[PDB]
Design a protein around this ligand. Structure first.
Ligand code: CLA
Ligand code: CLA
Ligand code: CLA
Ligand code: CLA
Ligand code: CLA
Ligand code: CLA
Ligand SMILES: CCCCCCCCCCCCCCCCCC(=O)OC[C@H](CO[C@@H]1O[C@H](CO)[C@H](O)[C@H](O)[C@H]1O)OC(=O)CCCCCCCCCCCCCCCCC
Ligand SMILES: CCCCCCCCCCCCCCCCCC(=O)OC[C@H](CO[C@@H]1O[C@H](CO)[C@H](O)[C@H](O)[C@H]1O)OC(=O)CCCCCCCCCCCCCCCCC
Ligand SMILES: CC1=C(/C=C/C(C)=C/C=C/C(C)=C/C=C/C=C(C)/C=C/C=C(C)/C=C/C2=C(C)CCCC2(C)C)C(C)(C)CCC1
Ligand SMILES: CC1=C(/C=C/C(C)=C/C=C/C(C)=C/C=C/C=C(C)/C=C/C=C(C)/C=C/C2=C(C)CCCC2(C)C)C(C)(C)CCC1
Ligand SMILES: CCCCCCCCCCCCO[C@@H]1O[C@H](CO)[C@@H](O[C@H]2O[C@H](CO)[C@@H](O)[C@H](O)[C@H]2O)[C@H](O)[C@H]1O
Ligand code: OEX
Ligand SMILES: [Cl-]
Ligand SMILES: [Fe+2]
Lengths: 447, 137, 35, 32, 82, 340, 335
């Protein structure tokens, strides 16, 4: 049906732009691959998983995602029951066969086009009504999903809260922040140091609360798009074609990919240092803690200690006066963490709590995170580039952040590429300049 | 130039008596040393306290003496300060604190002896390297 | 056409192909050496 | 003296940029 | 666009080729394997075996210190069970 | 005459053109590549650098190398039958004889190859601007792998044939020569980086100013291999860059010569700089800067910072990088900042 | 007036302007002008900056003892880190110049404008009816500036660790980077030089091949360039004679005969290679560094047999041990 007289081999999937039937097969077969991975990988992670050993020291990126949702974990991130991990893995792996089935079917057996075999499912790219409708469908499906998290958190068990009063533990959230001023306030937050925008979320109340808003808003906009058409400006602004719509979604993923990179790298709450590694700042903070703890036990007065530059070996001031850790760690004075906060006062690190309220669990916590900073090599050798082979480790925060940046970037390129073609495809010169009517030759010389 | 049993002969106790490890024990210790020590004691140093290393000489001048199998093994159960005038099992991995340091839960007495032997065999092989830091890398 | 067998191209190709596999076989064996 | 020399050459390059762009030879088509 | 040589496509596709090369190609491989696995390679290039970098006690490097009597100096390095 | 019959045969249009040049090219070129691939897997650098350098020892594609001979050898040609190896092959290998083997052979291989360019061009009757261009890679190899160590104490300080073994050659030149601070080097990267720009920008310009000569989207098929009309709008390209950049080409013949000039000129400048590094006539310092820095302990530039990095590089590397010097640097003499 | 705003939009989008000020241009031109003016003034007359936040001002301006090669615009203080530091965030300009204020003002304006510059490289292509994707090629050098000026600081947690705006300042960025990340032993960087070497290589390849296969239309004592007129119909060089030569240099099938397949390769190779080198800096911005083969190959007893990788490590140590003298108080450099 489709061959060289449509596109080149290396552009094969573009022959399916106008084959709704087969183009559905791809998306369903593809969606199976995503479920397949999630499933098969979880079982792979579990098969190597060692209970009496930190997750970040085992190259886990899926089991800690499950742990966050309050599953198989307890006090301090202690792994209790590995069955929920096994379940999530196998259930997925199974559903992949179901999706894969339909995928294969729609692409090589089922109707090559849909418009005739079902006018409801068949579609037209330029059909602004069908597009906003199909969009409306997915806008609801995603909306319910956002509430699926709210349900698990408030009713079906809860989530892992590192900020837990008695120390990190699975907690049932029964007070989601619904105040719009607070919720939507995050979007109005700076993206720089201190004010951290979306990544600055530091409690599950907002997390659960925010998702309630998103869930409703999403379904609300889902119904809106079912029962409407693009306005006036909305039509005279965008380009309406199969490629154009792709491009719009490509840059969208790109943007979210960048946001995700910063989330796993900075955020402490929705990315627990107990399951993942300690965040970048957290580790540098811990070193300052550790040696402040040590030397003080040797009889040193940390409060008045003068470093080489005369700045304050252990403690110094931030640009706005707050008492913070010394050294290069002055850049991470914006770090907040369960282990460190009880030492913090109304003006920053309190010299009195530091002097005699240091708890043993904090000391070894500082030691732990210090010796597990997100530093490593491609061949997985933990430490600085000059370290010696021994400790095989690279923080999960490092793997996730780097991977998702490469993807995010390339998607921004994918964006530019497909958006540039769509504009040329629409206006109709994506295949070369008209030898006869060459536009440039009709414009006055600027010389 | 090989790992002879001549090299795998390390002091068992304070009273001069020695023990001879096997290539199986060495490898096992080396693996176990990576599992629960390397994190802070990579290459015989101490990241969270560079003042004290795993040099045989340093372990000898410890209190009690920790430059032998018995010494190190005791330490791995009930660790103390360099003068021994204070128990530090709360902020240091050990058997009596396996609830706090999960890595130490699996570890059995066989593992302890292997790890202890490794600490004594490495300086015999690496020399100054085992003790020092980046300088000897 | 009635193509020949042994040619200058044949020679060239073999000067690289023959040692290569011999090396590829050699290196493959090295993956099992230890201490 | 040195600072003056550095800025001068720099200022000369920027001046060149101007003339290069706005006072170039008009690129004439075909009949050139 | 063509010369005397027989089009690779035909040769790599001809059954005769594989009938030949199913023998020749693995032969070289096994040969190369034996070259290493029999320790011959070590002697052909004077490459030290894992137990032949130092003497048991010695921790010094056998650095050649003069050009003309190098060969003699090298042999002397092999003497000390290195 | 047998000569013209020999000529006839050589200059015959085959799959792989031989030619008179081939008599020099192919032997050397093959031995050069062969010598490397040989040493890469089998030969060691223990007796010469105290280093493992082969797969046989456990090195990987990155850490493998054919290391230079010992510093004892001097600038000796290290012939297999020379006073050093004395006909012995094994000894020859252990003395780093394969380095001078790869170098000298490869050198003539580069000679033959340019000769090939000259010879083939003549036959086809095309201009030899392909041979002129290839002069830049020659100069580099000559200046770096031959001229430079010829100015130093021995072949030992030449870049060893290998991936990692080249990285240290970089770091060395930084630490010891402050090579980045050399104007000739700056022109070098300016040519290569600028050349990699011309390559990029011109290709993209052409592919996106093309005429439509087909009805498919994959415009690759829609090209006429038999000249005729220009496949891309040179006139449109002109007006484009003239409005986004302010300046634009308008003469394909100049545009392409420029693509020849820039990268070839760059590599040549970088060659001259290396020729100066042979006599150690480097661009290490700025006298005006040092004088103030001495008198004034509060004067600090990014230049002063770098030199401190160099001192660190020299001190910590020299011992294991120059075994023949029997260096012994006590912990207390090693230059160090605070904490680290 | 047909409509003021309607006319305005027509002037902006107009393809009859000497320089195409586009819609992206409306953001580009002001941002770039702010960037360049502040830069020029800074590079010449700016006072020393406490880059490392350790009260140790580094002068990088001409008037303060620098020349072109040494001079630079010093990154903001490490005490500021990733905090936003505009002029209206300082008690005075004196304070602003001391804490490396100008640096942020430049890099932010630049990256913004340079992004719009890419956006404009599409717009003009659209207004002129030519294919886009030229901006896609410019995305590679742009993504490098982003990686070096924004991504690496974000990852490392401070703008003080971004590449300085100067010659010698750039060298410092590299040497230190190599120490902490061992960039030479990282694939993405290696792919980078591959594109860059290859680029210059191919740039010389194509350049030479074409100019050598030019059709004769010039005198013996007349510039061979005049044998071409701006706005020609037919080609000015024998692409079939070019392929004939290069096809014999190596071997026929390893030679291009399709000009479109040629220029695509000419564009693809460097762009893709630099894309990776840009991803390298962005990846090692989260401390996923190059291969660590330190003390890999060891002998039968356990002794460490050094490789070139080890020789590299020693050089790296020297850089590490010596960089930022008085900035460190603790053993591990984790920031
Ligand atoms: C949601 C994501 C998405 C989707 C649906 C599409 C869809 C499409 N793209 Mg595409 N694209 C995307 C993202 C996406 N793109 C991104 C992010 C980029 C930037 C890199 C591109 C860049 C791009 C180009 C440059 C082109 C397309 C084209 C196309 C169309 C034809 C498909 C094709 O050529 O397949 C063919 C698929 C292949 C040849 C496979 C390529 C294999 C990749 C390069 C290697 C991946 C590395 C892998 C991870 C390593 C594996 C290891 C290996 C040893 C196994 C099709 C409509 C083509 C077109 O016609 O334009 C409209 C076209 O020319 N795309
Ligand atoms: C996610 C990956 C993916 C998916 C889902 C598709 C999907 C599709 N491609 Mg495709 N493609 C891809 C990647 C992908 N492509 C890449 C990377 C390239 C570049 C190399 C191409 C190049 C390409 C070309 C050139 C063409 C397509 C075409 C098609 C469509 C028809 C397939 C066909 O001809 O069936 C033929 C099927 C077979 C020959 C048998 C294959 C065996 C099946 C499909 C796989 C079985 C899966 C699994 C093992 C079985 C599980 C069973 C279990 C559930 C019980 C289909 C929608 C064609 C098109 O446009 O449609 C008209 C077309 O001409 N593709
Ligand atoms: C993209 C998301 C992602 C992330 C963050 C991780 C993260 C991780 N994986 Mg993983 N994995 C993924 C996807 C991902 N994986 C997928 C899709 C698969 C299916 C093939 C796997 C299969 C897998 C296995 C089987 C294992 C892991 C393991 C691991 C862990 C160790 C990492 C390591 O050593 O890898 C290092 C990997 C590399 C250095 C390879 C880098 C390859 C790059 C991307 C190639 C880029 C070249 C480019 C595409 C060329 C194209 C250009 C061309 C077109 C011109 C780590 C937590 C291991 C583990 O858990 O043990 C603890 C393990 O055993 N993963
Ligand atoms: C993206 C998902 C998707 C979509 C849009 C379609 C669309 C279509 N499929 Mg189909 N299919 C899919 C996945 C999908 N399929 C999968 C995964 C499989 C493998 C099991 C199949 C197997 C399959 C077969 C075997 C056949 C089709 C056919 C068809 C067409 C006729 C409609 C039909 O059969 O529905 C009829 C069913 C309904 C209208 C109602 C189904 C509702 C189900 C039972 C519940 C789903 C629950 C869902 C997961 C949660 C949503 C609720 C949430 C909002 C709260 C239509 C174009 C037929 C065809 O080719 O005809 C042209 C056909 O014979 N499909
Ligand atoms: C991802 C889901 C999604 C998608 C793809 C769409 C898609 C669309 N919506 Mg929409 N919508 C959604 C969810 C979604 N909707 C939800 C959940 C709601 C409920 C709140 C709505 C409510 C809604 C209304 C009320 C309307 C649309 C309309 C439209 C159409 C025109 C959009 C447009 O021109 O915006 C272009 C946007 C602008 C020109 C404004 C730019 C300024 C932005 C907002 C700020 C800068 C963004 C910045 C970069 C991000 C930083 C974050 C910020 C918080 C700091 C388009 C088809 C319109 C339409 O045609 O009706 C059918 C319309 O009137 N939507
Ligand atoms: C034409 C191709 C060619 C060329 C130019 C070279 C060039 C070289 N090879 Mg060589 N080589 C080649 C092919 C070639 N090789 C081939 C095919 C092989 C594989 C067998 C080798 C294997 C090889 C090895 C194993 C070695 C070399 C080495 C060398 C270098 C030193 C050799 C020397 O002293 O030359 C001597 C020059 C001549 C003999 C030319 C003499 C020509 C005259 C006209 C003949 C006169 C003879 C007559 C009796 C004189 C009478 C005078 C009277 C007073 C006695 C030199 C760069 C050595 C090296 O690299 O050292 C580091 C080395 O060890 N080669
Ligand atoms: C000096 C040169 C020494 C050359 C030594 C001989 C080399 C033999 C190569 C044979 C390859 C061949 O002919 O092309 C194999 C095919 C050409 O296919 C040709 O088709 C012809 C049809 O009449 C005949 O069948 C020829 O025999 C067949 O080779 O490849 C090409 O289409 C282009 C190849 C260009 C390869 C360039 C090197 C890139 C390698 C990629 C590796 C990266 C991974
Ligand atoms: C936004 C505005 C951007 C401002 C950009 C300024 C562009 C600089 C213009 C350079 C002058 C160009 C020129 O002389 O050639 C103008 C000529 C245009 O004229 C050419 O004349 C040739 C001879 O006849 C051929 O005919 C060409 O076809 C014809 O186009 O351009 C070239 O051919 C050279 C192209 C390479 C341009 C140099 C790159 C500029 C790099 C500058 C870096 C210096 C930085 C110093 C910083 C201190
Ligand atoms: C279209 C197309 C395509 C694609 C395809 C696809 C994409 C497919 C998919 C597929 C799929 C997606 C599949 C899936 C499957 C799955 C399955 C089949 C599963 C199974 C499971 C199971 C069996 C389970 C069980 C278990 C458990 C539970 C545990 C233990 C073990 C086990 C595993 C056994 C291609 C490109 C090729 C080509 C072109 C066309
Ligand atoms: C020295 C000497 C000599 C010489 C020798 C010879 C000449 C040899 C040869 C040799 C050879 C000639 C070898 C070869 C080898 C090869 C190899 C070993 C290869 C490998 C490959 C690979 C491994 C691949 C890879 C890849 C790539 C690259 C790309 C991508 C993909 C892949 C992965 C496939 C003589 C005797 C004369 C004399 C004496 C001395
Ligand atoms: C162009 C020029 C190319 C010249 C290539 C010459 C290559 C052959 O090189 C030749 O190698 C042989 C061994 O093979 C050396 O021979 C050496 O070893 C053999 C035994 O192996 C001894 O008996 C002999 O006395 C000794 O000289 C020769 O001294 C050298 O001349
Ligand atoms: O800034 Mn430049 O140098 Ca990245 O690392 Mn940490 O902080 Mn500093 O120390 Mn090194
Ligand atoms: Cl520095
Ligand atoms: Fe061209």
């Amino acid at each position: 049906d489709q061959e060289s007289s449509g596109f080149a081999w290396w552009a094969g999937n573009a022959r399916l732009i106008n084959l709704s039937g087969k183009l559905l097969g791809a998306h369903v077969a593809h969606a199976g691959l995503i479920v397949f991975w999630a499933g098969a990988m979880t079982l792979f992670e579990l098969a190597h998983f060692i209970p009496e050993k930190p997750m970040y020291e085992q190259g886990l990126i899926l089991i800690p995602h499950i742990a966050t949702l309050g599953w198989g974990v307890g006090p301090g991130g202690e792994v209790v029951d590995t069955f929920p991990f096994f379940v999530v893995g196998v259930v997925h792996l199974i559903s992949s066969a179901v999706l894969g089935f339909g995928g294969v079917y729609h692409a090589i057996r089922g109707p090559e086009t849909l418009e005739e075999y079902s006018s409801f499912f068949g579609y037209d790219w330029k059909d602004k009504n069908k597009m906003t409708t199909i969009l409306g469908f997915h806008l609801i499906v995603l909306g319910i999903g956002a509430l699926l998290l709210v349900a698990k958190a408030m009713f079906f068990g809860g989530l892992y809260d590192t900020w837990a009063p008695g120390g990190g533990d699975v907690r049932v959230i029964t007070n989601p922040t619904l105040d719009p001023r607070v919720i939507f306030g995050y979007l109005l937050k700076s993206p720089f140091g201190g004010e951290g925008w979306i990544v600055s979320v530091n409690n599950l109340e907002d997390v659960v609360g925010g998702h309630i808003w998103i869930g409703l808003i999403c379904i609300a906009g889902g119904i809106w798009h079912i029962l409407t058409t693009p306005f006036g400006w909305a039509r005279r602004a965008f380009i309406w074609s199969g490629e154009a719509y792709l491009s719009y979604s490509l840059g969208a993923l790109s943007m979210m990919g960048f946001i995700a990179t910063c989330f796993v790298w900075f955020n402490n709450t929705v990315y627990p240092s107990e399951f993942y590694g300690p965040t970048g700042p957290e580790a540098s903070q811990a070193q300052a803690m550790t040696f402040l703890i040590r030397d003080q036990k040797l009889g040193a007065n940390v409060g008045s200690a003068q470093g080489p530059t005369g700045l304050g070996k252990y403690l110094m001031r931030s640009p706005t006066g707050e008492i913070i850790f010394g050294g290069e760690t002055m850049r991470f004075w914006d770090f907040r963490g369960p282990w460190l906060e009880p030492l913090r006062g109304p003006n920053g690190l309190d010299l009195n709590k530091i002097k005699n309220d240091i708890q043993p669990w904090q000391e070894r916590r500082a030691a732990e995170y210090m010796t597990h900073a997100p530093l490593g090599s491609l061949n997985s050798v933990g430490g600085v580039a000059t370290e010696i082979n021994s400790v095989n480790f690279v923080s999960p925060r490092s793997w996730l952040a780097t991977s998702h940046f490469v993807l995010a970037f390339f998607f921004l390129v994918g964006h530019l590429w497909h958006a540039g073609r769509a504009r040329a495809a629409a206006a109709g010169f994506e295949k070369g300049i008209d030898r006869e009517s060459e536009p440039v030759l009709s414009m006055p010389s600027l010389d | 130039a090989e790992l002879t049993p001549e090299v795998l002969t390390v002091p068992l106790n304070s009273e001069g008596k020695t023990i001879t490890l096997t290539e199986k024990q060495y490898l096992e210790g080396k693996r176990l040393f990576q599992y629960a020590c390397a994190s802070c004691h990579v290459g015989g140093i101490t990241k969270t306290n560079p003042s004290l290393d795993l040099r045989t000489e340093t372990l000898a001048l410890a209190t009690p003496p920790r430059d032998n199998i018995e010494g190190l093994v005791d330490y791995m159960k009930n660790p103390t300060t360099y003068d021994g005038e204070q128990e530090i099992a709360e902020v240091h991995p050990s058997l009596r604190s396996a609830d706090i340091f999960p890595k130490m839960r699996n570890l059995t007495e066989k593992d302890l002896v292997a790890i202890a032997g490794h600490i004594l065999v490495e300086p015999k092989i690496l020399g100054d390297k085992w003790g020092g830091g980046k300088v000897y890398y | 056409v009635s193509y020949p067998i042994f040619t200058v191209r044949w020679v060239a190709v073999h000067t690289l192909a023959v040692p290569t596999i011999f090396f590829l076989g050699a290196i493959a064996a090295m993956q099992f050496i230890q201490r | 003296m040195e600072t003056i020399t550095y800025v001068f050459i720099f200022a000369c390059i920027i001046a060149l940029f101007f003339f290069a762009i706005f006072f170039r030879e008009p690129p004439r088509i075909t009949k050139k | 666009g063509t010369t005397g040589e027989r089009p690779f496509s035909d040769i790599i596709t001809s059954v005769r080729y594989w009938v030949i090369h199913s023998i020749t190609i693995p032969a070289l491989f096994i040969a190369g394997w034996l070259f290493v696995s029999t320790g011959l390679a070590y002697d052909v290039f004077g490459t030290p075996r894992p137990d032949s970098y130092y003497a048991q006690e010695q921790r010094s490097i056998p650095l050649v210190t003069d050009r003309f009597e190098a060969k003699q100096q090298v042999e002397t390095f092999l003497e000390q069970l290195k | 005459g047998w000569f013209d019959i020999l000529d006839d045969w050589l200059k015959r249009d085959r799959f792989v053109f031989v030619g008179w040049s081939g008599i020099l090219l192919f032997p050397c070129a093959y031995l050069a590549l062969g010598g490397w691939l040989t040493g890469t897997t089998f030969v060691t650098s223990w007796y010469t650098h105290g280093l493992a350098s082969s797969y046989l020892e456990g090195c990987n594609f990155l850490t493998v190398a054919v290391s230079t001979p010992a510093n004892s050898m001097g600038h000796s040609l290290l012939l297999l039958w020379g006073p050093e190896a004395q006909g012995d092959f094994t000894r020859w290998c252990q003395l780093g004889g394969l380095w001078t083997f790869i170098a000298l052979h490869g050198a003539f291989g580069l000679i033959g190859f340019m000769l090939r360019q000259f010879e083939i061009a003549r036959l086809v009757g095309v201009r030899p601007y392909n041979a002129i261009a290839f002069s830049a890679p020659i100069a580099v190899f000559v200046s770096v792998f031959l001229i430079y160590p010829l100015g130093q104490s021995s072949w030992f300080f030449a870049p060893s044939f290998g991936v990692a073994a080249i990285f240290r050659f970089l770091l060395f030149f930084q630490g010891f020569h402050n090579w980045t601070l050399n104007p000739f080097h700056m022109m070098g990267v300016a040519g290569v980086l600028g050349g990699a720009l011309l390559c990029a920008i011109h290709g993209a310009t052409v592919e996106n100013t093309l005429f439509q000569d087909g009805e498919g989207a994959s415009t690759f098929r829609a090209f006429n291999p038999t000249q005729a009309e220009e496949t891309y709008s040179m006139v449109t390209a002109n007006r484009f860059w003239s409005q986004i950049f302010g300046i634009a080409f308008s003469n394909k013949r100049w545009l392409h010569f420029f693509m020849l000039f820039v990268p070839v000129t760059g590599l040549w400048m970088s060659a001259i700089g290396v020729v100066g590094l042979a006599l150690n006539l480097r661009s290490y310092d700025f006298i005006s800067q040092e004088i103030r820095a001495a008198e004034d302990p509060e004067f600090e530039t990014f230049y002063t910072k770098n030199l401190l990095l160099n001192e660190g590089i020299r001190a910590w590397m020299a011992p294991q990088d120059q075994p023949h010097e029997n260096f012994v640097f006590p912990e207390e003499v090693l230059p160090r900042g605070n904490a680290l | 007036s047909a409509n003021l705003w309607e006319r305005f939009c027509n002037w902006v989008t107009s393809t009859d302007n000497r320089l195409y000020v586009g819609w992206f241009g409306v953001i580009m031109i002001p941002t770039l002008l702010a960037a360049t003016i502040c830069f020029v003034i800074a590079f010449i007359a700016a006072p020393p900056v406490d880059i490392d936040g350790i009260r140790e001002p580094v002068s990088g301006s001409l008037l303060y003892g620098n020349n072109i090669i040494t001079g630079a615009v010093v990154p903001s203080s490490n005490a500021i880190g990733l905090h936003f530091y505009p002029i209206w965030e300082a008690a005075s300009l004196d304070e602003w110049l001391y804490n490396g204020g100008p640096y942020q003002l430049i890099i932010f304006h630049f990256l913004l404008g340079a992004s719009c510059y890419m956006g404009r490289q599409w717009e003009l292509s659209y207004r002129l009816g030519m294919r886009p994707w030229i901006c896609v090629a410019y995305s590679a050098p742009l993504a490098s500036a982003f990686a070096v000026f924004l991504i690496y600081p974000i990852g490392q947690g401070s703008f003080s660790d971004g590449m300085p705006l100067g010659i010698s300042g750039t060298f410092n960025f590299m040497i230190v980077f190599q120490a902490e990340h061992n960039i030479l032993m990282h694939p993405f960087h290696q792919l980078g030089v591959a594109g860059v070497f290859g680029g210059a290589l191919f740039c010389a390849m194509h350049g030479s091949l074409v100019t050598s296969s030019l059709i004769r239309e010039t005198t013996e004592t007349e510039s061979a360039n005049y044998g071409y007129k701006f706005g020609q119909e037919e080609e000015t060089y024998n692409i079939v004679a070019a392929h004939g030569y290069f096809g014999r240099l190596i071997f026929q099938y390893a030679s291009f005969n399709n000009s479109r397949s040629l220029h695509f390769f000419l564009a693809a190779w460097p762009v893709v290679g630099v894309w990776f080198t840009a991803l390298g800096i962005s990846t090692m911005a989260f401390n996923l560094n190059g291969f660590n083969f330190n003390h890999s190959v060891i002998d039968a007893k356990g002794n460490v047999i050094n490789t070139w990788a080890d020789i590299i490590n020693r050089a790296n140590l020297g850089m590490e041990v010596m960089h930022e003298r008085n900035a460190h108080n603790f053993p591990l450099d984790l920031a």
